[PDB]
């Protein structure tokens, strides 16, 4: 041990440390500076950026021996605090740079390091700096972060007043449609929002820290578990196995389709008889710290009989393949799509037909924050789980039978969280922590490291797809045929539903009167499928939007004009036979056309012998809602102090559940003149908030937005004075009148898609868009650079522009990763951010352009649709279409790795 007297955030610290300790651990654990965020723990994400003697370093890879006596350290806490914000923090709030906020302290500290060395940076300088310092963001697409640094620099340089970094009310008084900052932004930019790992550090002594004993093979029969050595190890309390589970020890898929060949109870909580994928949790070590638990977990011995593993859909789906779940065939679900007339004869007599085989893979969500949760037994005897769940009520019912509790005896709460992008539509650690809290009776906390986040949370499910179009010479689509195989890994939850998305979205955007297709779901031993933003559309529309360009090529027609010819217009129906609710695609295409023409001409002009430029188009469509007559509930409450609490379980991945609530409520409450700062939101809690439903299917703005609207409308009526005006709280209480008022809303017109035909009206609101990608391909290396992305977006009406701009930029960036670099195929190699192709800032163009072409939705609140998943529906198709435009080669199987592109170029 050594004494180190240094200065941290301007204050002398008399530090006592191990020379080998990591600065991140010292700052967080010894000094309580939890504003230093830790994600990857491998120097790759920049979340733990601190300033050490004028240099920006990653604290997670900086040992204390590198900190000199008398060193100066600055963390986010030293940059600024609430009510003492630095211009960088004010700028972040104003520009909406804090979505999940997990990367915000690191970016801001890093940015301070930049401005202290280069006071007047170009945008390019800012981007170079964040690239060098590895500052990673998965939510924002980086553009808002650069915007914030530039605005801050102008103020610091005296070129602009600081008051200009503060939001100015539109004087309208209207915050709906505005750039009003989100309520949580100040906490996020000051590092004073506690995420799950921060909470763990602030839990009492006596809290047990958990480590997972995980399978190190993909498939096995388990013969036994020996915990003997683990029990003798430092700090170890106990080891938990399936024997300690008080219920079924299975998670239920809950809404498993009746035509599913499996019962939906396939997923264990702790493995008992079998390992189904690499990483499966077999036991939990409980110890006095994460470190001691992890050390002891290494010594737990599992005796198993390894079985041959099926590591792809085609492999598991072979007629001969052995059943992974004995008694259920590996191909456990099929969804037909049968619209209009038989397609065979139509293909035979059509002027032109095209066909392609396409693949989209096992995309990893890669939030900067790895999975974390905790549980305890309340004094009330209930078991409480606090996690990254984005569907607290959904997960309660998925896990309660498995853990052995009635619904009344379990409470799920959503912690502030550093992004999910859908992986948290699935339970991950909730049943694990519940089992441990129940068994020990103690508080328990479980933090996944980044390798566990990669290997042992769900993934976008790979689809092998064959799609065909028949059309007339003039481009009019006549028929489509489709076949898709969905590799869902071993656990069935929502696999059948994901397969149904193929019937709804392959070929979406166009009038296609005649469709014959079949989707199949197959269990494998690769990572289990959990929703990934777009959920079936990124696969489906990659195929159909690539195939549209192939059809255009074969016709000798411009690909934008072929889309224009076929795009939804009144009288048309979508693939499930339903009439679209608005018709915005022709409008969007017409508005994009000259920008597209200009982009083509720039590409031809700027292409060289070695660097070929191209332009690519695609359309995106997706539902806002869960299938059928989805519903939500909210309570609007007038409080004693004149503030109003809008109670919902709108789960915040980081997308903006707080601002969605506040902006929708503000608009609804306008008759009563309620200032936005007086409107409070509620963190999701199954005990004390209504069942608003999960934050999945880009549904909350529509479903919960409408419920909030209804609740606020009803509160207005509850407050109305006879004669005009409104009662105050004190008046209503003195009159013994209610002050907490319920609102409910249901998507009444929606119906579930039929199990035989796939036809139905699954959503009453959809999101529509048109993408344009501009790219440069180095033909010597096969490397593609995306130089610009454009999204024409119809969101009906914007609740908040900071929220919607950021959503689109974030989805576009994920689209660049899906197109060019991302996968989870190799269990080890893809278990790091850099290994799995995470897009760092230079991979995302500074030019991310949005054009809103909003057609108010009949059923959306104030006409709004959702936005969440729109920007990831097909941007990767536009990019691949742009590569084809540039070079003449088509990549059918994502991602377009340089070597793959070179092989295609040289073929
Ligand atoms: S770089 Fe330190 S946590 Fe990622
Ligand atoms: S706001 Fe950057 S990772 Fe979420
Ligand atoms: Cl998906
Ligand atoms: Cl390919
Ligand atoms: Cl490569
Ligand atoms: Mg100041
Ligand atoms: Mg027609
Ligand atoms: Mg090769």
Curated annotation (Swiss-Prot):
Molecular-function GO terms, alphabetical: 2 iron, 2 sulfur cluster binding; aldehyde dehydrogenase (FAD-independent) activity; iron ion binding
SMART domains found in the cross-reference section: Ald_Xan_dh_C
Binding-site positions, [2Fe-2S] cluster 2: 100, 103, 137, 139
Coiled coil (UniProt feature): none
Gene for this chain: mop
Enzyme Commission number, as recorded: 1.2.99.7
Catalytically driven reaction(s): an aldehyde + A + H2O = a carboxylate + AH2 + H(+)
Cofactor: binding comment: Binds 1 Mo-molybdopterin cytosine dinucleotide (Mo-MCD) cofactor per subunit. Binds 2 [2Fe-2S] clusters per subunit.
Species this chain originates from: Megalodesulfovibrio gigas
Quaternary state and interactors: Homodimer.
UniProt entry keywords in alphabetical sequence: 2Fe-2S, FAD, Flavoprotein, Iron, Iron-sulfur, Metal-binding, Molybdenum, NAD, Oxidoreductase
List of residues binding [2Fe-2S] cluster 1: 40, 45, 48, 60
Binding site for Mo-molybdopterin cytosine dinucleotide: 653, 869
Co-factor(s): Mo-molybdopterin cytosine dinucleotide; [2Fe-2S] cluster
2Fe-2S ferredoxin-type domain: residues covered: 2-79
Name under which the protein is recorded: Aldehyde oxidoreductase
Record-stated family: Belongs to the xanthine dehydrogenase family.
């Amino acid at each position: 041990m050594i004494q180190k007297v240094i200065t941290v955030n301007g204050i002398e610290q008399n530090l006592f440390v191990d020379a080998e300790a990591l600065l991140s651990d010292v700052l967080r654990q010894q000094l309580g500076l939890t504003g230093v965020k830790v994600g990857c723990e491998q120097g790759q994400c920049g979340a733990c950026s601190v300033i050490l003697d004028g240099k920006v370093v990653r604290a997670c890879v900086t040992k204390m021996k590198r900190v000199a006596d008398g060193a100066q350290i600055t963390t986010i806490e030293g940059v600024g605090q609430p009510e003492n914000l630095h211009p960088l923090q004010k700028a972040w709030v104003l520009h909406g740079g804090a979505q999940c906020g997990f990367c915000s302290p690191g970016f801001i500290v890093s940015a301070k390091g930049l401005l202290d060395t280069n006071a007047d940076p170009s945008r390019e300088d800012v981007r170079d700096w964040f690239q060098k310092h590895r500052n990673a963001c998965r939510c924002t697409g980086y553009k808002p972060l650069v915007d914030a640094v530039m605005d801050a620099a102008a103020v610091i340089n005296g070129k602009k007043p600081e008051t200009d970094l503060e939001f100015k009310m539109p004087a309208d008084g209207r915050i709906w449609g505005s750039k009003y900052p989100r309520p949580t932004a100040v906490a996020k930019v000051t590092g004073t929002l506690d995420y799950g790992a921060d909470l763990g550090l602030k839990m009492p002594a006596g809290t047990l820290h958990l480590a997972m004993v995980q399978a190190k093979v993909s498939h096995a029969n388990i013969k036994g578990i020996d915990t003997s050595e683990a029990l003798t190890m430092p700090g170890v309390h106990s080891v938990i196995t399936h024997k300690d589970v008080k219920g079924k020890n299975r998670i239920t898929g809950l809404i498993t389709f009746p035509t599913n060949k499996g019962d939906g109870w396939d997923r264990p909580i702790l493995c008992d008889e079998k390992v189904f994928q690499y990483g499966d949790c077999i036991a939990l070590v409980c110890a006095d710290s994460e470190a001691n638990a992890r050390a002891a977990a290494e010594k737990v011995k599992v005796d198993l009989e390894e079985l041959p593993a099926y590591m792809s859909g085609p492999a598991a789906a072979a007629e001969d393949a052995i059943e992974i779940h004995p008694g259920t065939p590996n191909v456990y679900f099929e969804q037909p799509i049968v619209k209009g007339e038989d397609t065979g004869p139509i293909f035979a007599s059509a002027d032109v037909t095209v066909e392609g085989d396409f693949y989209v893979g096992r995309q990893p969500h890669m939030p900067i924050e790895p999975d974390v949760a905790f549980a305890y037994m309340g004094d009330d005897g209930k078991c409480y789980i606090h996690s990254k769940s984005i569907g607290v009520h959904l997960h309660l019912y998925m896990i309660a039978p498995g853990v052995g509790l009635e619904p009344d005896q379990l409470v799920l709460v959503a912690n502030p969280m550093g992004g999910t992008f859908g992986y948290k539509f699935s339970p991950t650690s909730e049943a694990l922590v519940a089992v441990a809290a129940m068994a020990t009776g103690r508080p328990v906390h479980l933090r996944y490291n980044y390798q566990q986040q990669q290997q042992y949370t769900g993934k976008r499910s790979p689809w092998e797809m064959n799609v065909k179009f028949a059309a007339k010479k003039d481009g009019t689509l006549l028929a489509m045929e489709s076949d898709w195989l969905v590799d869902h890994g071993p656990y069935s939850e929502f696999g059948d539903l994901l397969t149904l998305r193929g019937a709804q979205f392959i070929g979406a955007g166009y009038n296609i009167p005649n469709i014959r297709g079949l989707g199949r779901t197959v269990a494998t031993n690769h990572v289990w499928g959990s929703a990934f933003r777009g959920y079936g559309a990124p696969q489906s529309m990659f195929a159909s939007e690539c195939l549209m360009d192939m059809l255009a090529e074969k016709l000798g027609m411009d690909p934008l004009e072929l889309r224009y010819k076929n795009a939804y217009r009144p009288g048309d129906t979508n693939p499930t036979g339903q009439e679209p609710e608005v018709f915005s695609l022709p409008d969007m295409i017409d508005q994009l056309r000259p920008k597209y023409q200009a982009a083509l001409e720039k590409a031809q002009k700027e292409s060289t012998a070695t660097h070929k430029k191209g332009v690519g188009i695609s359309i995106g469509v997706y539902g806002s809602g869960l299938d059928g007559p989805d519903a939500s509930e909210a309570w609007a409450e007038l409080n004693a102090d004149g503030t109003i609490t809008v109670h919902t379980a709108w789960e915040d991945h980081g997308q903006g559940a707080d601002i969605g609530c506040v902006g929708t409520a503000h608009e609804a409450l306008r008759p009563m003149g309620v200032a936005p700062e007086k409107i409070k939101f509620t963190w999701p809690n199954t005990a004390t908030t209504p069942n608003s439903g999960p934050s999945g299917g880009s549904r909350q703005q529509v479903m919960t937005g409408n419920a909030i609207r209804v609740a606020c409308e009803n509160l207005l009526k509850a407050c109305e004075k006879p004669g005009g005006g409104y009662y105050t709280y004190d008046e209503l209480k003195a009159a013994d009148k209610p002050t907490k008022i319920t609102g409910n809303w249901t998507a009444s017109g929606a119906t579930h898609c039929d199990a035989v035909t796939g036809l139905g009206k699954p959503f009453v609101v959809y999101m529509y868009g048109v993408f344009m990608a501009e790219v440069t391909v180095d033909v010597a290396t096969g490397q593609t650079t995306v130089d610009g992305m454009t999204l024409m977006a119809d969101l009906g009406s914007l609740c908040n522009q900071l929220a919607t701009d950021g959503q689109i930029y974030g989805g576009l960036a994920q689209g660049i990763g899906l197109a060019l670099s991302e996968d989870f195929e190799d269990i080890k190699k893809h278990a790091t951010l850099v290994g799995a192709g995470f897009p760092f800032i230079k991979q995302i163009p500074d030019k991310l352009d949005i054009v809103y072409v909003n057609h108010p939705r009949p059923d959306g609140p104030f006409g709004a649709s959702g936005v969440g998943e729109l920007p990831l529906t097909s941007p990767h198709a536009a990019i691949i279409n742009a590569i084809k435009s540039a070079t003449g080669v088509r990549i059918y199987r994502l991602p377009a790795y340089p070597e793959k592109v070179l092989e295609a170029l040289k073929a």
